[PDB]
Design a protein around this ligand. Structure first.
Ligand code: GDS
Ligand code: GDS
Ligand code: CA
Ligand code: CA
Ligand code: CA
Ligand code: CA
Ligand code: CA
Lengths: 209, 210
């Protein structure tokens, strides 16, 4: 396969790029890194920023989950139709990463005491994505433009993991709700999301969700 | 009138790198300044996509997210690598810059007193990947990716400048980063901008800490 994904046995920051690859019919190899192997230190020391994911595209080695998403976006034509739409794609993805950031901070550093405040704040954090859908073909296509982009895969994962954290959190948002259903029904993606490759990995590395 | 408008607090902050980019590229822009009082009134904030600044206008294109603005100017002004592989390396650098900027912002705004010594102790391990990247590209003598400037250079340069204010001499451990700061800061239009009142008379951050 042209691609290799190197990561812990978790969905985490590789979930969206895996959905992208599956949906696009691309083949890849998973190199699973155990925490025992990670704690040994040598792989970590070799990583540019001492972190995973690490990704290989033939001779090219990449780090940074959003670098991997933008690279796949660029090379597979999942980055909008022109420079103006590419900027809108980036603006969506940077917004997804900000909330993913907040989610990861809750999960790994403050889950027991901070979940109440997080869930209370969540509608205000999701509403921008509903507003963006409402301004693009009535929400009937994708988050930017009329073709899928890497930002759609990242937003879709963000929405899925938030439905597990806070069940019902999309019920006030009809366009986000319909978008989750529509993209989740794309045949290759539907098959991936139902497969044990996806279903039998935990969302996060500490067993919280 | 200029095609660009930057809408921000009277701070360098997350606009410093994109302003350096615009000035070094000889582009004109308008600064729209937002006071704390205006921000607190709430109307502008409610109208912002994610409730935050910067906001950037390029004609009728309205953008938010500082790295979105950097990438957009990187596309439209040809500062995004020579091909697809280089563009990915440019992203990889910028995402690393943003991760450390993140940590810097968290120190400055939420934990300066108690956290500064720990931060400064961790800092060489956080700067070293950028020294390593320079060492692997033409011996560190040109740019952070490839042989032409990219938006990631302006963001990294800003990152390095504010860390020298936070931890003077921190680049003494990193000869290629140190020479790089000096070199890029000497580019004539950028040198002029960095010396000018419109840069020097803004604070680095919004809370008076640096
Ligand atoms: N920007 C990079 C981030 C990559 C990243 O964070 N990788 C993590 C896994 S997902 S991140 C999962 C978890 N993150 C956190 O615990 C961060 C929570 C809080 N907000 C904080 O800033 O400390 C974590 O593993 N943090 C790492 C740590 O602090 O030790 C990793 O490799 N960790 C191994 C390591 O660093 O040794 C990307 O997008 O890929
Ligand atoms: N991802 C966006 C970030 C934009 C952003 O953070 N904008 C800030 C100014 S620079 S950021 C400076 C400062 N950060 C902090 O106070 C805390 C940083 C820590 N990591 C945390 O998240 O808790 C801050 O203003 N945090 C926002 C806040 O809590 O009000 C803003 O508009 N704030 C006004 C607002 O939100 O109302 C981008 O890249 O442009
Ligand atoms: Ca394998
Ligand atoms: Ca396409
Ligand atoms: Ca339902
Ligand atoms: Ca324009
Ligand atoms: Ca160029």
């Amino acid at each position: 396969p042209p691609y290799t994904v190197v990561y812990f046995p978790v969905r985490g920051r590789c979930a969206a790029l895996r959905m992208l690859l599956a949906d696009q019919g691309q083949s890849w190899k998973e190199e699973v890194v155990t925490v025992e192997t990670w704690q040994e230190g040598s792989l970590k020391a070799s990583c540019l920023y001492g972190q995973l994911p690490k990704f290989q595209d033939g001779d090219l080695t990449l780090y940074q989950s959003n670098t991997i998403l933008r690279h796949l976006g660029r090379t597979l034509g999942l980055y909008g139709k022109d420079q103006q739409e590419a900027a809108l794609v980036d603006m969506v993805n940077d917004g997804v990463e900000d909330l993913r950031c907040k989610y990861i901070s809750l999960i790994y550093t403050n889950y027991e005491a901070g979940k109440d405040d997080y869930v209370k704040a969540l509608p205000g954090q999701l509403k921008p994505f509903e507003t963006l859908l409402s301004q693009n073909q009535g929400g009937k296509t994708f988050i930017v433009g009329d073709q899928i982009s890497f930002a759609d895969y990242n937003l879709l994962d963000l929405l899925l993991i938030h439905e597990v954290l806070a069940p019902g959190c999309l019920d006030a948002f009809p366009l986000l709700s319909a978008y989750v259903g529509r993209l989740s029904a794309r045949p290759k993606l539907k098959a991936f999301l139902a497969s044990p490759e996806y279903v039998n990995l935990p969302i996060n590395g500490n067993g919280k969700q």
